[PDB]
coagulation Factor Xa
Amino acid sequence: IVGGQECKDGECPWQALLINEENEGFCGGTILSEFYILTAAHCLYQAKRFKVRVGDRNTEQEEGGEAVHEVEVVIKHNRFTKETYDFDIAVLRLKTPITFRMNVAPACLPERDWAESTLMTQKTGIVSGFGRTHEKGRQSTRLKMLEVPYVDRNSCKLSSSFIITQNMFCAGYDTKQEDACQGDSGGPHVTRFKDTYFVTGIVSWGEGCARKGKYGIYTKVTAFLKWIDRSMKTR
Amino acid sequence: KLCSLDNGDCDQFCHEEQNSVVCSCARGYTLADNGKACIPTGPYPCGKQTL
Ligand SMILES: O=C1CN(S(=O)(=O)c2ccc3cc(Cl)ccc3c2)CCN1CC1(CO)CCN(c2ccncc2)CC1
Ligand SMILES: [Ca+2]
């Protein structure tokens, strides 16, 4: 994350982090229920074996509310394409239930039609993670959350250097030095509405980090809803 | 009608059942008696920031 504030005690309780053998964070996730985590499908390649850590805000000073779960089965979207990041979405199944507590709670899933009319036409959205603080910096020990405003879909398309498929959407800034970055992929993109946040997107990709005239491309959760449902029954 | 005025006065999902509007909520919730609000049926409801 570049810019943004710091996730304060209880602010980003739906964040989840996928760690590797070395116990290093390398991608985000979003707790949907006690058994399922929502994440970007490309992240399912940066590790021979990983685990999803939840309830952790500062990697180093044991807050106590942490907790590590081993994935039971991983459900990657059939139509993923490393060549274009289309259908960049997956859903992990934990072997043991996530126990909800402070800095640990599941984020809501909206209704397709409703979310596109009221949740995305909103002025901004939340995106968080443990990713780099500068385009070419290190990861991050403190969990961060940035308020990325919604981007016009056409400026979106024109600014890119790559296709923006049906399952994608822009968010962030043209000039302001604020945007997700390496290690934030899979991370949650939530929208707040009346003190309630809905999972309106999966951190997918970007051309650099906070580069002028370039935006941050997320996965369009609303476009995948039925899939997430059909996946939380495992498939 | 019109879930456009102000989300139809719902705390969450809104629909325009033919004539007027109907409210509903996410899982783990329950529509209050006023058919407009949303009430948590548990201690750690989705969307809410732990506190
Ligand atoms: O793979 C990467 C990852 N980094 S990154 O780790 O700092 C990175 C990762 C995820 C991000 C998500 C948001 Cl919302 C914002 C910024 C981001 C930056 C940037 C460059 N690239 C290279 C690419 C080019 O910039 C990433 C996207 N791509 C295509 C191709 C065809 N169709 C769509 C996308 C090809 C390689
Ligand atoms: Ca810790």
In short: The longest strand of chain A covers residues 197-206. Chain A has three helices and 13 strands.
